[PDB]
Symmetry: C2
Subunit: 164 residues, 2 copies
């Protein structure tokens, strides 16, 4: 059931506290700039922004390498800007159901929970994504760590992207 | 906080992920599609506007707090008639309304109020409570909670419906 897709979620770390610190005027400007940054970088990796959730985005890619490259570029850009906003990123792949400009299904929820596990500045991918990129020449992962994900049974191993 | 005054209602399904996993994607998509139509219908009856979806819930704008609360009351009633339990939180304040979206700290606050609600419950912030027996709505005495990202405590009031 559903078409196979790679889902990337972004979320800003402690965005509510940031918004409260800087005030709504500054926040709207910051989030507009951030939206444009994410949108541009997604487009470069032939991805599609499915939707935004205030301080985060759900993004779809056809290939896992595109999702990871996008995450890598986004973290790089955020580091460059910081000269502050930290973003966590999670990537998962599997079948999901399209409805309008949205995605539904357990693999959407799982991608979101993978992102929720990541620290600010970090890109985490699920084991299927790591395995699919086991033979990549430029993408490197740590040895992963075991977590449990809300709503799911059992344990999942999540892998951090190690960028050049 | 900047922008125009708006009433923001959030819904959220309790343990939707576990529910998805138990019944499967086929059944879940059918269920959430049905749920979406129900929420959209009830929102429109109280002159609200769905701003967006957040997977298993919605962000809704109303001009007046009585509209948002009546919507929540009808939604909870409807869900009982129909298992999915929904949390509902309502806040009001100034927000920036740009490109068919709402931005600002009062958006985040409304989300946090909804996250504090029990499944089956409608929680409102103090400003909503204060703005409303003249219009047929009753509340408990409130509970004081901390909300992630905000300093100090906030008194949240449950709607007591017939
Ligand atoms: N434009 C928007 N659309 C939808 N939701 C929004 C919007 N703006 C704010 N929100 C809400 O505000 C909240 C953003 O805060 P979030 O829950 O990510 O915690 P945070 O303060 O970033 O802390 P952390 O993510 O580090 O736990 C979300 O729950 C989201 O629903
Ligand atoms: N179609 C979708 N679009 C966007 N996000 C989705 C979608 N489906 C699932 N999600 C994500 O999965 C999340 C479910 O998270 P939530 O934190 O609400 O968990 P839950 O399983 O409902 O448990 P509880 O709400 O009781 O904590 C959604 O809020 C959203 O972040
Ligand atoms: Ca966040
Ligand atoms: Ca939920």
């Amino acid at each position: 059931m559903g078409s196979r897709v790679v889902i990337l979620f972004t979320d800003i770390e402690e965005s509510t506290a940031l918004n409260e610190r800087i005030g709504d005027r500054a926040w709207v400007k910051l989030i507009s700039s951030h939206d444009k940054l994410v949108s541009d970088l997604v487009r470069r990796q032939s991805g599609h922004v499915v939707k935004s959730q205030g301080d985060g985005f759900m993004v779809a890619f056809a290939r896992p390498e595109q999702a990871v490259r996008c995450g890598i570029e986004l973290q790089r850009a955020l580091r460059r800007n910081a000269n502050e906003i930290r973003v966590r990123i999670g990537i998962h792949m599997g079948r999901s159901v399209r409805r309008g400009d949205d995605l539904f299904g357990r693999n959407v929820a799982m991608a979101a929970r993978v992102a929720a596990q990541a620290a600010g500045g970090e890109i985490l991918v699920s084991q299927p994504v790591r395995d699919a990129l086991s033979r990549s020449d430029g993408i490197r992962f740590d040895d992963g760590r075991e977590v449990e994900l809300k709503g799911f049974s059992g344990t999942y191993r999540l892998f951090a992207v190690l960028a050049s």
